[PDB]
RNA sequence: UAUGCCAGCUGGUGGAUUGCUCGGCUCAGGCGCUGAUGAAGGACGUGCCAAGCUGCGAUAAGCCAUGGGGAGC
RNA sequence: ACGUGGAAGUCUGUUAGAGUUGGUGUCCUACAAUACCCUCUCGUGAUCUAUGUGUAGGGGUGAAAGGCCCAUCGAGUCCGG
RNA sequence: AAAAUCCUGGCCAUAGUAGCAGCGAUAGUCGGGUGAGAACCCCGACGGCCUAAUGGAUAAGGGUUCCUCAGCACUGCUGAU
RNA sequence: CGAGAACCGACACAGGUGUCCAUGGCGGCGAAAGCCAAGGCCUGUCGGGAGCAACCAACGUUAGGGAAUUCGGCAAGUUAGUCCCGUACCUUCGGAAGAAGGGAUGCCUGCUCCGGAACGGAGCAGGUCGCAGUGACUCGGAAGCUCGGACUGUCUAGUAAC
RNA sequence: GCGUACAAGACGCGGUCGAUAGACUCGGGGUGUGCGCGUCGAGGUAACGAGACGUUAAGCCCACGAGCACUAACAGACCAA
């Protein structure tokens, strides 16, 4: 039939071949096509128009995205993967112990800590003695 | 003339046929022959209209019992 | 070995037409032949067959 | 008396048979080298439409001269 | 004690890819002159793979079974004797 | 020649029989178009299948299978516009 | 064209055949499953009919018993993800080990902690539904004695993988 | 139009002088109380909040029975001494 028309149609349409309308009941026109100009004319007289592309579901992902990624819909009995592979170490570990090191380099730099007490904290933070910077500060006193 | 009658279409869909193949095609067949041997006509176009309705969901899922409108004219049998 | 395929899959060119011998005959992994001539500048024969 | 057996008849299928011979097989007489002046050989081309073969070679199933031949090609 | 780190013919894994244990299932005038399905082994390594290239028949190639060298192998195939 | 699992061709029974189901891809249905003819050619709707592939781009290899028009004797596991 | 019809396999052959797209969404450890886009398809190309029997291929569920079956538990089933607790003999001190065994797991409301932050991770309190919360899917049954070869690896392309 | 029957075929029942099948309603059954909203709820400024109770013998569902001609058993064909 008008498979060929289908060849054009989606082309000068700019859609896929699958999504290209047909009238139907306008198979006389479209049929007698046979020219790219012809098909994009009949396009104008909407007999030739296609669409109905699918859209993302957003149903499974949405509310779930805003729940998990926040505390919820997690726990033990959801998460697969080991303890690592979600909330890794050797990552978080450089989240602190990186900031910390810094704020014992801007101190004793700043001059606030002499050089016997920046040394001490120094390798006493790169040795799990600290919690967060604030914890660090508190012990700093 | 115009009459309303309920189409019963379990007898085919889910009754037989393939659940995950047809349902939709089965439904049309059944419908085509209750409107027919009712009217006494060979067959009616019957669509589109109750064809989206018939398959307005997946092929598999089918709606049981669609009511319809009917019209026939005296000429070539409609 | 036996066609499986295990053979036939081989998609390599070989044994194309030789310049002077119409037959394809000439391999590409070889130098020239499998029909008359090349390397010998004569004609190719061989008595592996015809009695002389 | 279906299903069916045996023989024939009409028609078919098939291509035997008979007849026919543009092909073979064999013997005999004569004759007998070609090529770098490219056989030689091969490649690729070349036709209105051209795949094969043949012929040709970018002047390409051909060009010229003489002679023969003859109303067709 | 805490950190440092990440090694490995290392582990799990139908990631890709490779292999081929059992079912002695299906098939067995096949889809197939070695196939289909479930199961199963390996999966950074002596790993897997494309293309190119080398070694030729009493010769090659062989982590060796007499395995493989185009469905041909305790001596390939073709033709000749 | 009656004979050689004899050679070549033709032909009967077998049989209107087996196969055209089996595979993690079970796929169509209702209207309509064209046509001498439509279950499978095309339009729409509804229903589905494929997600490292039944999607996109390519190597080798094939070699015109590409596009158009006209067709159905051949080929297409049925039919065919 | 590049392939369940354009390649090799005598065929429109369920076989074989290299590269790049590995960053589409939810999911989750994930290039996994499952579902869905974009894109492709209804050509892994014969149909129609019978509640559609026997018999066969794949497969589901079977009370009570629980390997009595059988050469042999072959086949099928069981377990299963993640976190916490805990873990024997032996040992080349590496391992054995996920030994074993026991507990937890959903949803909702409000929060704390780590981090610059994530639509990252780890916890807390309270409320609450089901027979069942890794609710599908994905996902080990475990233990002991003996023989052999130390191990990873190789092998009869096509009945042998030891 | 259906089964007290059944692989094809066969068999049996009913066909408006009708309860044969479906729909609907009820009876009889299976699960185990629905959506929504209201109160409570460890807490949290709050946002928010697993869950509890009430509404609710709920909700959802049925291959059985009855009532009921609403729908469909129409129309009509053929064979026969």
UniProtKB/Swiss-Prot annotation, chain A:
<comment type="subunit">
    <text>Component of the large ribosomal subunit (LSU). Mature yeast ribosomes consist of a small (40S) and a large (60S) subunit. The 40S small subunit contains 1 molecule of ribosomal RNA (18S rRNA) and 33 different proteins (encoded by 57 genes). The large 60S subunit contains 3 rRNA molecules (25S, 5.8S and 5S rRNA) and 46 different proteins (encoded by 81 genes). eL19 lies in close proximity to the binding site for eukaryotic initiation factor eIF4G.</text>
</comment>
<feature type="cross-link" description="Glycyl lysine isopeptide (Lys-Gly) (interchain with G-Cter in ubiquitin)">
    <location>
        <position position="19"/>
    </location>
</feature>
<dbReference type="GO" id="GO:0002181">
    <property type="term" value="P:cytoplasmic translation"/>
</dbReference>
<dbReference type="GO" id="GO:0005829">
    <property type="term" value="C:cytosol"/>
</dbReference>
<protein>
    <recommendedName>
        <fullName>Large ribosomal subunit protein eL19A</fullName>
    </recommendedName>
</protein>
<keyword id="KW-1017">Isopeptide bond</keyword>
<keyword id="KW-0597">Phosphoprotein</keyword>
<dbReference type="GO" id="GO:0003723">
    <property type="term" value="F:RNA binding"/>
</dbReference>
<feature type="modified residue" description="Phosphoserine">
    <location>
        <position position="28"/>
    </location>
</feature>
<feature type="modified residue" description="Phosphoserine">
    <location>
        <position position="89"/>
    </location>
</feature>
<feature type="compositionally biased region" description="Basic residues">
    <location>
        <begin position="57"/>
        <end position="66"/>
    </location>
</feature>
<comment type="similarity">
    <text>Belongs to the eukaryotic ribosomal protein eL19 family.</text>
</comment>
<feature type="cross-link" description="Glycyl lysine isopeptide (Lys-Gly) (interchain with G-Cter in ubiquitin)">
    <location>
        <position position="58"/>
    </location>
</feature>
<feature type="cross-link" description="Glycyl lysine isopeptide (Lys-Gly) (interchain with G-Cter in ubiquitin)">
    <location>
        <position position="51"/>
    </location>
</feature>
<keyword id="KW-0687">Ribonucleoprotein</keyword>
Curated annotation (Swiss-Prot), chain B:
<dbReference type="GO" id="GO:0022625">
    <property type="term" value="C:cytosolic large ribosomal subunit"/>
</dbReference>
<comment type="function">
    <text>Component of the ribosome, a large ribonucleoprotein complex responsible for the synthesis of proteins in the cell. The small ribosomal subunit (SSU) binds messenger RNAs (mRNAs) and translates the encoded message by selecting cognate aminoacyl-transfer RNA (tRNA) molecules. The large subunit (LSU) contains the ribosomal catalytic site termed the peptidyl transferase center (PTC), which catalyzes the formation of peptide bonds, thereby polymerizing the amino acids delivered by tRNAs into a polypeptide chain.</text>
</comment>
<dbReference type="GO" id="GO:0003735">
    <property type="term" value="F:structural constituent of ribosome"/>
</dbReference>
<dbReference type="GO" id="GO:0006450">
    <property type="term" value="P:regulation of translational fidelity"/>
</dbReference>
<keyword id="KW-0963">Cytoplasm</keyword>
<dbReference type="GO" id="GO:0002181">
    <property type="term" value="P:cytoplasmic translation"/>
</dbReference>
<keyword id="KW-0689">Ribosomal protein</keyword>
<comment type="similarity">
    <text>Belongs to the eukaryotic ribosomal protein eL31 family.</text>
</comment>
<keyword id="KW-0687">Ribonucleoprotein</keyword>
<dbReference type="GO" id="GO:0005829">
    <property type="term" value="C:cytosol"/>
</dbReference>
<protein>
    <recommendedName>
        <fullName>Large ribosomal subunit protein eL31A</fullName>
    </recommendedName>
</protein>
<comment type="subunit">
    <text>Component of the large ribosomal subunit (LSU). Mature yeast ribosomes consist of a small (40S) and a large (60S) subunit. The 40S small subunit contains 1 molecule of ribosomal RNA (18S rRNA) and 33 different proteins (encoded by 57 genes). The large 60S subunit contains 3 rRNA molecules (25S, 5.8S and 5S rRNA) and 46 different proteins (encoded by 81 genes).</text>
</comment>
Curated annotation (Swiss-Prot), chain C:
<keyword id="KW-0689">Ribosomal protein</keyword>
<feature type="binding site">
    <location>
        <position position="33"/>
    </location>
    <ligand>
        <name>Zn(2+)</name>
    </ligand>
</feature>
<dbReference type="GO" id="GO:0002181">
    <property type="term" value="P:cytoplasmic translation"/>
</dbReference>
<dbReference type="GO" id="GO:0000448">
    <property type="term" value="P:cleavage in ITS2 between 5.8S rRNA and LSU-rRNA of tricistronic rRNA transcript (SSU-rRNA, 5.8S rRNA, LSU-rRNA)"/>
</dbReference>
<keyword id="KW-0963">Cytoplasm</keyword>
<comment type="subunit">
    <text>Component of the large ribosomal subunit (LSU). Mature yeast ribosomes consist of a small (40S) and a large (60S) subunit. The 40S small subunit contains 1 molecule of ribosomal RNA (18S rRNA) and 33 different proteins (encoded by 57 genes). The large 60S subunit contains 3 rRNA molecules (25S, 5.8S and 5S rRNA) and 46 different proteins (encoded by 81 genes).</text>
</comment>
<keyword id="KW-0862">Zinc</keyword>
<comment type="function">
    <text>Component of the ribosome, a large ribonucleoprotein complex responsible for the synthesis of proteins in the cell. The small ribosomal subunit (SSU) binds messenger RNAs (mRNAs) and translates the encoded message by selecting cognate aminoacyl-transfer RNA (tRNA) molecules. The large subunit (LSU) contains the ribosomal catalytic site termed the peptidyl transferase center (PTC), which catalyzes the formation of peptide bonds, thereby polymerizing the amino acids delivered by tRNAs into a polypeptide chain.</text>
</comment>
<feature type="zinc finger region" description="C4-type">
    <location>
        <begin position="18"/>
        <end position="36"/>
    </location>
</feature>
<dbReference type="GO" id="GO:0003723">
    <property type="term" value="F:RNA binding"/>
</dbReference>
<dbReference type="GO" id="GO:0003735">
    <property type="term" value="F:structural constituent of ribosome"/>
</dbReference>
<protein>
    <recommendedName>
        <fullName>Large ribosomal subunit protein eL37A</fullName>
    </recommendedName>
</protein>
<dbReference type="GO" id="GO:0005829">
    <property type="term" value="C:cytosol"/>
</dbReference>
<feature type="binding site">
    <location>
        <position position="36"/>
    </location>
    <ligand>
        <name>Zn(2+)</name>
    </ligand>
</feature>
<dbReference type="GO" id="GO:0019843">
    <property type="term" value="F:rRNA binding"/>
</dbReference>
């Amino acid at each position: 039939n008008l498979r060929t028309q289908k060849r054009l149609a989606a082309s000068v349409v700019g859609v896929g071949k699958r999504k290209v309308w047909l009238d139907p009941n306008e198979t006389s026109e479209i049929a007698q096509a046979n020219s790219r100009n012809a098909i994009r004319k009949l396009v104008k007289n909407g007999t030739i128009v296609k669409k109905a592309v699918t859209v993302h579901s957003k149903s499974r992902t949405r509310a779930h995205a805003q729940s998990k990624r926040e505390g919820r819909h997690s726990g033990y009995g959801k998460r697969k993967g080991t303890r690592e592979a979600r909330l890794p170490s050797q990552v978080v570990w450089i989240r602190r112990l990186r900031v910390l090191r810094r704020l014992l380099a801007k101190y004793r730099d700043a001059g606030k800590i002499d050089k016997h007490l920046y040394h001490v904290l120094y390798k006493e933070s790169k040795g799990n003695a600290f919690k967060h910077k604030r914890a660090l500060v508190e012990h700093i006193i | 003339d115009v009459v309303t009658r309920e189409y019963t279409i379990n007898l085919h869909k889910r009754l037989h046929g393939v659940s995950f193949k047809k349902r939709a095609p089965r439904a049309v067949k059944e419908i085509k022959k209750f409107a027919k041997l009712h009217m006494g006509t060979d067959d009616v176009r019957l669509a589109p209209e109750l064809n989206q309705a018939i398959w307005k969901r997946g092929v598999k899922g089918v709606e049981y019992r669609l009511r319809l409108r009917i019209s026939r004219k005296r000429n070539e049998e409609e | 070995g036996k066609g499986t395929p295990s053979f036939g899959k081989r998609h390599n060119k070989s044994h194309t037409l030789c310049n002077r011998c119409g037959r394809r005959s000439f391999h590409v992994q070889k130098k020239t032949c499998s029909s008359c001539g090349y390397p010998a500048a004569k004609t190719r024969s061989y008595n592996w067959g015809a009695k002389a």
